[PDB]
Amino acid sequence: EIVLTQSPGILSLSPGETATLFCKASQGGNAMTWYQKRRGQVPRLLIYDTSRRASGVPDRFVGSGSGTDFFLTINKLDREDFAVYYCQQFEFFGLGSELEVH
Amino acid sequence: DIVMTQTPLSLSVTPGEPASISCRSSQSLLHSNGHTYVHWYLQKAGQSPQLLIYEVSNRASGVPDRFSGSGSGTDFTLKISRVEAEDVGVYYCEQTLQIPFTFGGGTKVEIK
Amino acid sequence: AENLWVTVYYGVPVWKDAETTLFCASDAKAYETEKHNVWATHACVPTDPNPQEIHLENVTEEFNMWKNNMVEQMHTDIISLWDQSLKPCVKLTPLCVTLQCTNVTNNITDDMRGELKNCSFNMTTELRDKKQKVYSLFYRLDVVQINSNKEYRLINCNTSACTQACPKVSFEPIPIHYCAPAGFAILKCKDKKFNGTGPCPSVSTVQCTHGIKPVVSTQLLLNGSLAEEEVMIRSENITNNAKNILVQFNTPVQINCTRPNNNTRKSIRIGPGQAFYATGDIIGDIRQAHCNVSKATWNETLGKVVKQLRKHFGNNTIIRFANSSGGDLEVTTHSFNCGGEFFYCNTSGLFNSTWISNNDSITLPCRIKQIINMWQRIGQCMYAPPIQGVIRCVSNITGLILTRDGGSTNSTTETFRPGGGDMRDNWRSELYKYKVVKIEPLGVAPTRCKRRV
Amino acid sequence: MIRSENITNNAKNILVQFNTPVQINCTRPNNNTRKSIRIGPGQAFYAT
Amino acid sequence: PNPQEIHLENVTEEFNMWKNNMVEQMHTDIISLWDQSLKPCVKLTPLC
Amino acid sequence: AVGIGAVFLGFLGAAGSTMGAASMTLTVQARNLLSGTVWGIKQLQARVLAVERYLRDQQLLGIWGCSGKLICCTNVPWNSSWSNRNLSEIWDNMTWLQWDKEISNYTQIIYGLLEESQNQQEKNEQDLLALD
Amino acid sequence: AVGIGAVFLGFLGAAGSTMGAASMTLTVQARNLLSGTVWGIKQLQARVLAVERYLRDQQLLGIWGCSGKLICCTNVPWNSSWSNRNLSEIWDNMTWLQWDKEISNYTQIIYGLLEESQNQQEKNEQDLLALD
Amino acid sequence: QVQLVQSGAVIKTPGSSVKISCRASGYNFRDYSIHWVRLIPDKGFEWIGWIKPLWGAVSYARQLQGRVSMTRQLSQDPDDPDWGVAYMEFSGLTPADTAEYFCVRRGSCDYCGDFPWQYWGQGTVVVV
Ligand SMILES: *[C@@H]1O[C@H](CO)[C@@H](O[C@@H]2O[C@H](CO)[C@@H](O[C@@H]3O[C@H](CO[C@H]4O[C@H](CO)[C@@H](O)[C@H](O)[C@@H]4O)[C@@H](O)[C@H](O[C@H]4O[C@H](CO)[C@@H](O)[C@H](O)[C@@H]4O)[C@@H]3O)[C@H](O)[C@H]2NC(C)=O)[C@H](O)[C@H]1NC(C)=O
Ligand SMILES: *[C@@H]1O[C@H](CO)[C@@H](O[C@@H]2O[C@H](CO)[C@@H](O[C@@H]3O[C@H](CO[C@H]4O[C@H](CO)[C@@H](O)[C@H](O)[C@@H]4O)[C@@H](O)[C@H](O[C@H]4O[C@H](CO)[C@@H](O)[C@H](O)[C@@H]4O)[C@@H]3O)[C@H](O)[C@H]2NC(C)=O)[C@H](O)[C@H]1NC(C)=O
Ligand SMILES: *[C@@H]1O[C@H](CO)[C@@H](O[C@@H]2O[C@H](CO)[C@@H](O[C@@H]3O[C@H](CO)[C@@H](O)[C@H](O[C@H]4O[C@H](CO)[C@@H](O)[C@H](O)[C@@H]4O)[C@@H]3O)[C@H](O)[C@H]2NC(C)=O)[C@H](O)[C@H]1NC(C)=O
Ligand SMILES: *[C@@H]1O[C@H](CO)[C@@H](O[C@@H]2O[C@H](CO)[C@@H](O[C@@H]3O[C@H](CO)[C@@H](O)[C@H](O)[C@@H]3O)[C@H](O)[C@H]2NC(C)=O)[C@H](O)[C@H]1NC(C)=O
Ligand SMILES: *[C@@H]1O[C@H](CO)[C@@H](O[C@@H]2O[C@H](CO)[C@@H](O[C@@H]3O[C@H](CO)[C@@H](O)[C@H](O)[C@@H]3O)[C@H](O)[C@H]2NC(C)=O)[C@H](O)[C@H]1NC(C)=O
Ligand SMILES: *[C@@H]1O[C@H](CO)[C@@H](O[C@@H]2O[C@H](CO)[C@@H](O[C@@H]3O[C@H](CO)[C@@H](O)[C@H](O)[C@@H]3O)[C@H](O)[C@H]2NC(C)=O)[C@H](O)[C@H]1NC(C)=O
Ligand SMILES: *[C@@H]1O[C@H](CO)[C@@H](O[C@@H]2O[C@H](CO)[C@@H](O)[C@H](O)[C@H]2NC(C)=O)[C@H](O)[C@H]1NC(C)=O
Ligand SMILES: *[C@@H]1O[C@H](CO)[C@@H](O[C@@H]2O[C@H](CO)[C@@H](O)[C@H](O)[C@H]2NC(C)=O)[C@H](O)[C@H]1NC(C)=O
Ligand SMILES: *[C@@H]1O[C@H](CO)[C@@H](O[C@@H]2O[C@H](CO)[C@@H](O)[C@H](O)[C@H]2NC(C)=O)[C@H](O)[C@H]1NC(C)=O
Ligand SMILES: *[C@@H]1O[C@H](CO)[C@@H](O[C@@H]2O[C@H](CO)[C@@H](O)[C@H](O)[C@H]2NC(C)=O)[C@H](O)[C@H]1NC(C)=O
Ligand SMILES: *[C@@H]1O[C@H](CO)[C@@H](O[C@@H]2O[C@H](CO)[C@@H](O)[C@H](O)[C@H]2NC(C)=O)[C@H](O)[C@H]1NC(C)=O
Ligand SMILES: *[C@@H]1O[C@H](CO)[C@@H](O[C@@H]2O[C@H](CO)[C@@H](O)[C@H](O)[C@H]2NC(C)=O)[C@H](O)[C@H]1NC(C)=O
Ligand SMILES: *[C@@H]1O[C@H](CO)[C@@H](O[C@@H]2O[C@H](CO)[C@@H](O)[C@H](O)[C@H]2NC(C)=O)[C@H](O)[C@H]1NC(C)=O
Ligand SMILES: *[C@@H]1O[C@H](CO)[C@@H](O[C@@H]2O[C@H](CO)[C@@H](O)[C@H](O)[C@H]2NC(C)=O)[C@H](O)[C@H]1NC(C)=O
Ligand SMILES: *[C@@H]1O[C@H](CO)[C@@H](O)[C@H](O)[C@H]1NC(C)=O
Ligand SMILES: *[C@@H]1O[C@H](CO)[C@@H](O)[C@H](O)[C@H]1NC(C)=O
Ligand SMILES: *[C@@H]1O[C@H](CO)[C@@H](O)[C@H](O)[C@H]1NC(C)=O
Ligand SMILES: *[C@@H]1O[C@H](CO)[C@@H](O)[C@H](O)[C@H]1NC(C)=O
Ligand SMILES: *[C@@H]1O[C@H](CO)[C@@H](O)[C@H](O)[C@H]1NC(C)=O
């Protein structure tokens, strides 16, 4: 089975800054998807195929990396973006990192 | 009238980092004869403007690869790859597709 | 010297990838059978002898079979000429009458259930005033209960009145040679080791493909295009669970499907010149239609595909099989055609094993359905008529259509399961060698000559 | 702009085309719930 | 008008009228346009 | 004997060979470029796409100096911003499919250059003929 | 700079200009002359009317001395009963649409004169080549 | 647009069997797969299985076999052929199975696997 490990756990910041999110796989040569779930809402898609964007996603969301390392860098943090962020490869999900205000 | 808008207003660039100056027209600039009629000019303050990039994604007879032209219809980007001390000045975007010829508002680049 | 000049060159070998409309080439030997006993034997083009399969030395070409076209066009037009052979045939509207059905005369045991219903109804004759009282026979998968007494109706009578199929035409597969039009070549990959994607370093150009048999089987592909040396498995991302693994194996496994009821036909007249063929009496015994494969041959073939599957999932992996967990009647079953009647078998004595890294026949109990809703369109079906006598065919199982099982645990086993699904996956076992390129002459190259004045 | 054929003819229409638009606001205020009557096999008929 | 029927002097040509074509095509299409003039016309089923 | 099937190749025969051996036989790709009730309209829209895209290549060829000559020099110089390759390699090093990737940006600049270099040469032929 | 959209006109661009400025650019009307279940037959009978009336003009051009040369002198003299105009005017006074009214009776006399003046020139080229 | 409407929340007993509708509308239902994702607290997301609704070919997870069953119902009328409904019968519940159940769908995206699910359901919470 592919297992996915999210690094930072709770990443607390302030709005306006830039956060990175590093997710580590266990099988190289695949895609990646990044799911954002706010508090008490329906989750939404951000990234697929490690680089592209969903329908109606601002261009401050960008993800890169290949092999077994995959980064999701968010520039110019809003107040809405403090949510849980999920990795997903083929069926397996990460446990989810959390963004909190400072 | 067609509008030539230039982004950004002014850039303070480091020598070596790739710089980008963008300009957008009101419509596409591809003509049936086979050339894209979007141009780019260099002007020093107190000096007459000189042509840099004609028929974009092709260099002129005297400019190196420090300047580049790319983009598509209605979206034009001038890319300055390697910055020298002589790279400072005001750049202009201008169309030679239709009459009249409209110019950009001007993009100043200075030294740090 | 350095004053190089442009010289154009017309008629120069280069190609780009493209997609345009291809056409048939039916074999000329099948032209003797008169006036469309199968679809598309007068409609499209007579073939050529000895097609110029010519090698292309020192050529590599990036093939693909999953994002390939011409298996999308082949699914499109075969739907369309299936509709071409039903517009002459008789619409079967006045059969939607409230039937009255009893058990067929048979030794009704409580363990078994009635496979054939009697269903005597009323139907107009050729005169508009009189109404004859005729009887027929119907399978249990064609009648539902209108709810003392017990009166049924046809299953498709809700929402889709649909045509008969004329017994002049025949549903047998004839070969179809797809040919490119003028200005387009068809590259054929001659590599004996070639999965789905990837550069094929030995190509060859044809103008017409080899004989493709359009068959309709969901699982257990039939009658076509065995492999060269090994048993080749091929997919998209093999760590994905929604993309089928089209196994295509090397030696064929002979299947022996039959139907042993005699099933005498009779003709009920709907109106003026519109006959309707219903099965009358059945002579002999009421026996279940089945299929056979040799257990010594089939288990040996699963011994091959369990070796090549370990090349993608590592060794010491306990590979097991199962029997297609759920679905409709045409995907949980081995659904195929045989002589003009539509068998739905039960591959659950086949795909049931487990394998660790260290003369008799298997009988598959099939069942027959008469109305047919291939490709699941909204307002169509096709009442296939009965056919006389015992029906028997012999086919080669050539490839399976497996599907992995989407685990999320730290297990070792990988329970593969068969599943038909989309009908395109049958034709991707025939059109993976071929891509279609567009010949693009009129190149340009610099050399040292100038047009003198 | 008004435009016609012979304007001293009476059988040729005068296609007036005017310059600023006049906004029309047509409506129908019945709610008019639909229902489906089945004619036969797969032939629905929608009646109010 | 006036189709150019023009002579061919010093020309002999091996004709045939029994294995001739175009009397086979003429029988083919006159059957077909006889069927073209019956598809608009009314089917006469309820007279039986 | 004389006449063998070895060097007398077929359609797309030299498709991997170098340009100096592909321009030896260009006629074999040239002559197989035109010849070779709803599935008759799949025959019609396959035929009038073949004769249309053949005439389109015979028109772009026609308005340059090359009517049917099939190999012809021209007058435009070869600007090294296009290809920047040596001459002594690209007739025995590369192959034609490797060339078509190497130049595909710069077509429709060459095709636009060729028409003006012909029409300038066309009327200048008339001005030479008009004075005498 | 070099390359402007002023004098580089488009399709039918010089349609009111004089003949001496319309014959400067004839290629722009030349190249936009071929390229650019019942409404597909409105596509078919629009396409095979375009490629047919293009070939008809390429045949009447072909059987004169002008294969694809697009401007070519000939040998027939200009009888003044046709036009009776001065030469020094009709390249800078008139325009092409004013010319097409001024001559339209006398075509199919010129088109008949051009074929015989070519075929006489064609076999006389052979009789010069045959004796030597 | 694409809309997936689920069913309301339920209260079940250990040993019962839920049924969670997922009515799809706004696209052709005979083309795109429908998956089912269960979101458990303290465990993250978890997959269940898809249903290719042309015929109804399903495939479940490995650790949920024998306890889940997904059927579908198509739209058999040519006056309205886009809508449809998928189901899920999750049998043999447990107090360790109380979670939120989502029906998803892949995006019409063509560079895009079956798993990057674009449009989601509203979410059905199930308490045991
Ligand atoms: C595709 O093909 C497969 C393979 O045959 C089919 O699977 C079989 O389905 C049948 C029907 O459900 C199964 O038959 C049933 O088996 C049960 C288990 O049998 C064991 O236990 C009984 C005592 O309980 C022993 O006598 C027996 O020897 C076994 O040890 C039985 O309990 C069932 O019998 C009960 O029901 C019948 C009918 O009501 C009564 O007559 C009986 O008296 C009793 O009450 C029944 O015999 C069979 O086991 C399956 N095969 C397997 C699991 O390998 C698929 O069904 C078929 N596909 C489709 C779609 O049908
Ligand atoms: C299942 O497996 C298949 C194949 O086995 C994978 O499909 C390939 O996926 C990769 C990566 O997603 C694709 O590569 C991408 O190609 C795009 C198109 O490039 C075309 O043109 C080039 C040049 O001619 C060809 O070499 C190429 O093959 C294509 O034909 C590019 O736009 C992409 O670049 C973008 O993404 C990368 C990485 O994010 C960035 O670095 C770039 O800057 C750019 O943003 C990329 O190169 C490839 O085309 C796919 N097809 C094939 C046939 O290989 C599936 O991804 C895989 N799926 C899963 C879920 O695992
Ligand atoms: C895989 O390929 C095999 C190839 O052998 C194929 O088996 C053959 O199928 C054909 C037709 O599908 C069978 O041919 C029939 O043979 C019987 C007995 O000879 C004939 O009576 C049949 O004629 C019938 O049809 C005529 C026209 O409709 C009627 O006028 C006539 O009265 C009959 O009703 C027909 O010729 C053939 O017997 C088998 N078997 C062999 C060994 O050839 C098999 O069907 C293919 N599998 C699949 C799934 O397609
Ligand atoms: C389906 O049900 C029908 C309706 O009963 C069956 O048809 C009828 O079967 C009976 C019994 O065989 C026939 O009756 C016999 O007729 C002969 C000749 O008239 C007579 O000598 C016998 O004494 C007996 O009466 C009957 O003719 C026959 N047909 C009709 C129209 O009633 C039919 O057999 C059933 N289907 C199958 C497959 O058996
Ligand atoms: C794949 O194989 C399994 C065997 O492991 C099949 O399961 C068996 O299916 C039959 C019929 O579906 C079941 O018989 C009936 O079960 C129902 C209740 O589900 C009952 O009402 C009937 O009286 C009868 O008992 C049988 O119990 C079941 N066995 C097991 C162990 O699950 C399955 O059907 C096969 N799949 C296909 C597509 O053939
Ligand atoms: C799928 O594979 C399994 C495992 O091989 C098969 O289960 C086994 O089937 C055999 C044959 O019925 C059972 O043998 C027993 O034989 C005795 C004496 O002949 C008889 O009294 C029993 O009633 C039974 O037939 C064996 O116990 C059984 N094993 C298990 C664990 O169930 C299964 O039959 C295969 N499926 C099909 C459709 O063949
Ligand atoms: C076929 O038509 C006959 C003739 O009408 C039907 O027979 C009658 O049916 C009605 C309605 O059930 C009864 O009230 C009459 O008593 C019947 N008469 C006779 C002589 O049977 C018959 O029901 C129709 N259907 C079938 C299946 O036979
Ligand atoms: C059309 O008729 C069919 C046949 O009865 C209907 O299918 C059954 O509908 C009942 C509703 O009470 C269900 O309980 C059965 O399970 C259905 N049968 C099957 C095989 O699914 C169908 O619902 C009717 N309507 C439409 C729109 O098809
Ligand atoms: C089909 O074959 C090709 C070529 O062998 C495979 O492509 C490479 O396979 C290796 C094997 O792990 C990967 O590491 C590479 O990333 C693949 N791509 C490239 C561009 O080298 C391909 O994986 C095979 N596909 C299947 C389903 O087996
Ligand atoms: C199926 O039933 C038919 C009908 O009886 C059988 O055909 C008969 O065959 C015998 C000799 O074989 C002839 O004398 C009869 O005239 C035939 N009857 C008809 C109606 O044709 C046929 O033989 C049976 N099938 C098999 C395999 O025995
Ligand atoms: C399927 O049926 C065919 C023909 O009915 C079988 O082929 C025959 O097999 C026997 C047994 O070895 C031979 O004696 C015959 O010569 C074979 N005939 C032909 C025409 O091949 C075949 O063996 C059967 N296969 C299975 C698995 O039952
Ligand atoms: C089923 O398999 C047999 C065995 O391979 C096929 O018979 C071969 O047919 C080809 C076609 O010309 C011959 O070249 C081989 O010599 C045959 N082999 C044997 C052992 O007879 C048969 O064609 C396959 N298909 C069908 C429909 O029966
Ligand atoms: C449309 O406009 C034209 C041009 O202005 C008109 O043509 C002339 O109009 C005058 C006005 O009285 C007449 O005396 C002339 O006889 C017209 N013809 C010519 C050739 O000069 C035309 O009448 C206008 N039509 C309408 C309906 O207003
Ligand atoms: C027209 O009538 C329909 C039918 O009552 C109204 O639709 C209802 O709207 C209420 C809330 O607005 C819902 O609770 C009902 O379920 C709806 N019924 C149906 C059948 O959809 C509709 O609102 C009316 N039109 C207007 C403008 O009020
Ligand atoms: C007839 O078929 C029904 C179908 O359920 C069955 O229950 C019944 O036992 C059969 N036999 C008789 C005599 O009704
Ligand atoms: C199937 O074939 C393998 C191959 O060696 C053999 O070992 C085994 O006994 C066969 N029979 C089974 C699994 O019933
Ligand atoms: C699995 O076994 C085969 C036996 O042929 C061997 O070649 C292969 O290397 C083994 N796999 C690994 C990962 O060692
Ligand atoms: C063609 O242009 C694109 C961008 O305009 C560039 O990426 C590519 O490298 C160019 N092709 C060649 C052969 O240089
Ligand atoms: C052409 O001929 C007609 C009568 O034959 C005559 O009226 C007309 O004036 C002529 N055209 C010119 C331009 O002279």
Q: Where are the domains of chain A?
A: 1-102
F48 touching chain G per CB within 8 A: yes
Contact G73 F119 (CB under 8 A): no
CA of F82, closest CA in chain B: separation in Å? 9
Whether C410 sits inside 8 A of A1 (CB atoms) is: yes
Distance CA H34, CA C239 (A): 19
User: Are residues C423 and C216 in contact, defined by beta-carbon separation less than 8 angstroms?
Assistant: yes
Where residue F82 falls (left for φ over 0; alpha for ψ -120 to 50; beta otherwise) is: alpha
Instruction: Give the closest-approach CA distance of C97 to chain E in angstroms.
Output: 20
Q: Atom 12 in ligand 18: which residue has the minimum CA distance? A: F102
Q: Contact at 8 Å (CB) between C117 and C138?
A: yes
Q: What tokens appear for C15 in the block?
A: 């190609």
Q: Nearest residue on chain B to F108, judged by CA atoms?
A: B34
CB contact under 8 A, F61 and C442: yes
CB of B59 within 8 Å of any CB in chain F?
A: yes
Q: Is any atom of ligand 7 closer than 6 Å to the C-beta of C122?
A: yes
**CA B73/CA B53 separation, integer angstroms:** 17
Q: Give the pair of three-digit tokens for residue H72.
A: 């579908």
Residue in chain C nearest E44 by alpha carbon? C272
- C403 and H30: CB-CB below 8 Å? no
Token pair for residue A5? 């490990």
A1-102 topology per CATH: Immunoglobulin-like (2.60.40)
Residues of C in contact with A1 (CB under 8 A): 407-411
Strand H68-69 and strand F71-77: the pairing is: unpaired
How many other CB atoms are found less than 10 A from the CB of residue C85?
19
What's the DSSP call for residue G100?
A: H
Cβ G119 vs Cβ G44: under 8 Å = no
Q: Say yes or no: CB of residue C16 within 6 Å of ligand 7.
A: no
Quote the ligand 1 centre to C291 CA distance (angstroms): 20
- Give the number of other Cβ atoms within 10 Å of residue C358's Cβ: 4
Bridge-partner residues for D47, per DSSP?
D35
Q: Does the C-beta of C252 come closer than 6 Å to ligand 12?
A: yes
Residues 6+ apart with CB under 8 A from C230: C193, C250, C308
For the Cβ of C323 lying below 6 angstroms from any atom of ligand 6, the answer is no
Contact assessment for residue G65 and residue G74, using Cβ atoms and an 8 Å cutoff: yes
- Using CB distances shorter than 6 Å, the residues near ligand 2 are A 30-31, 49-51; C 64, 197, 236-237; H 113
Contact H108, H56 (CB under 8 A): no
Query: Longest C-alpha distance within chain E, in Å?
Result: 66
Structure tokens at F70: 């099939």
Which among C167, C173, C168, C163 has a CA at the least distance from the CA of C40? Answer: C173
Q: Kindly report the nearest CA distance between residue G2 and chain F, in angstroms.
A: 15
Following DSSP, what letter does each residue of F55-113 receive, concatenated?
Answer: HHHHHHHHTTT-SS-SEEEEEEE--TTT----TTTTTTSSBHHHHHHHHTTTTTTHHHH
Q: What is the DSSP letter of C376?
A: G
Q: How far is H78 from chain A (nearest CA, A)?
A: 30
- Per DSSP, the residues of C345-356 read ---SSSS--EE-
Q: Determine the 3-state secondary structure of C221 from DSSP.
A: strand
CA distances from D15 to C5, D3, D18, D20, D24 (A): 63, 6, 10, 16, 19
Provide the 8-state DSSP code for C30. Answer: G
B51 CB within 8 Å of a chain G CB: yes
Contact by Cβ (8 Å): C405, C415: yes
D35 in helix, strand or coil?
A: strand
CB contact under 8 A, F105 and B33: no
DSSP C416: E
For C224, residues 6+ apart whose C-beta sits below 8 A from its C-beta are: C212, C213, C215, C398, C429, C430
Question: Does the Cβ of C390 fall within 6 Å of ligand 10?
Answer: yes
Q: Are G27 and G77 in contact (CB under 8 A)?
A: no
The chain H residue lying nearest A95, using CA atoms, is H44
Of C399, C242, C405, C235, nearest in space to C320 by CA: C405
What is the spatial distance between Cα C225 and Cα E28, in angstroms, rounded to a whole number?
A: 42
Pairing of strands C361-365, C203-206: unpaired
Residue A19: both structure tokens together: 């956060």
Cβ-Cβ contacts under 8 Å, F129 against chain C: none
Chain F interface includes G54 (CB < 8 A): yes
Distance, CA of D40 to chain centre? 32
C195 contacts C232 by C-beta, under 8 angstroms: yes
Q: Tokens for E2, please give them.
A: 């006036």
Q: Does the Cβ of D4 fall within 6 Å of ligand 13?
A: yes
CB crowding H12-38: b at 16 or more within 10 Å, else e: eeeeeebebbbbbbebebbebbbbbbb
Solved with: cryo-EM
Q: Which of H44, H116, H122 sits opposite A93 (nearest CB)?
A: H44
Cβ separation A90–C240 shorter than 8 A: yes
DSSP letter (8 states) at residue C163? E
Partner H, chain D 1-48, Cβ-Cβ below 8 Å? 36, 42, 44, 46
Contact C126, C150 (CB under 8 A): no
**What does the block give as tokens for C334?**
């081995």
Contact in structure between A11 and A22 (CB atoms under 8 Å): no
* Ligand 13 nearest-atom number relative to CA D4: 27
* Residue C333 Cα: closest atom of ligand 5: 38
Taken in order E30, E35, E36, E38, the sign of the CA dihedral is positive
Output the six-digit token pair for C197: 């994607």
Delimit the domains of chain F by residue range. 12-129
**Which token pair is G18?**
């004089």
Q: Tokens at residue C172, please?
A: 């047998």
Write the CA distances from H20 to C55, D27, H4, H115, integer angstroms: 59, 41, 12, 21
Q: Whose CA is nearest to atom 3 of ligand 9?
A: C198
Tokens of F104: 């595909």
Contacts of C172 (CB under 8 A, 6+ apart): C38, C339
Is the distance from CB of H65 to CB of H92 less than 8 angstroms?
no
In angstroms, the Cα distances linking G78 to G22, G71, G81, G117 are 21, 17, 9, 13
Distance from residue C133's CA to the centre of ligand 7 (Å):
10
Strands A97-101 and A10-13: parallel
Of A87, A97, A101, A96, nearest to A31 by C-alpha is A87
Report strand pairing: C15-17 vs C434-439.
Answer: antiparallel
Burial class of residue C186 in the structure, from the number of CB atoms within 10 Å of its CB (0-12 exposed, 13-18 middle, 19+ buried): buried
3-state SS assignment for residue C434: strand
Nearest to F52 among G23, G51, G70 (CB): G51
G38/H67 Cα distance (integer angstroms):
54
DSSP-assigned letters across all residues of chain B: ----EEE-SEEE--TTSPEEEEEE-SS--B-TTS-B-EEEEEE-TTS--EEEESSSSS--SS--TTEEEEEETTEEEEEE-S--GGG-EEEEEEE-SSSS--B---EEEE--
In angstroms, rounded to a whole number, what is the distance separating the alpha carbons of residues B77 and B20?
A: 7
* Positive or negative torsion for Cα F75, F85, B81, F106: positive
The whole-angstrom separation of Cα E40 and Cα A99 is 73
**Spatial separation of the C-alpha atoms in residues H82 and H25, rounded to whole Å:** 6
| Closest chain H residue to the Cα of C413, Cα to Cα | H62
CB D14 within 8 A of CB D2: yes
Residue indicated by tokens 């809703």: C373
Closest to C305 (Cα-Cα) out of C383, C243, C398:
C398
Cβ <8 Å between G70 and F123: no
Chain D neighbours, 3+ Cβ pairs < 8 A: C, H
Cα→Cα distances C363→A81, B59, C258, Å: 61, 75, 11
Instruction: Report the chain C residue with the minimal C-alpha distance to residue H74.
Output: C378
Atom 4, ligand 12: residue with shortest CA distance: C252
Inter-residue long-range contacts of G16-21, CB under 8 Å, 24+ positions, other chains counted: G16/G95, G16/G97, G17/G95, G18/G91, G18/G92, G18/G93, G18/G94, G18/G95, G19/G90, G19/G91, G19/G92, G19/G94, G19/G95, G19/G96, G19/G99, G20/G91, G20/G92
Interchain CB distance below 8 Å, C93 and D42: no
> B-F interface: how many C-beta pairs under 8 angstroms?
12
Contact of C372 with C396, CB cutoff 8 Å: no
Inspect the interface and report whether the beta carbons of C127 and E45 lie closer than 8 Å: no
The rounded Å distance from CA G106 to ligand 19 centre is 9
Task: Please report how the helices F41-62 and G41-62 are oriented relative to each other, as an axis angle in degrees rounded to 10.
Answer: 40
SS3 content of chain A, % helix, strand, coil (to 5): 0, 45, 55
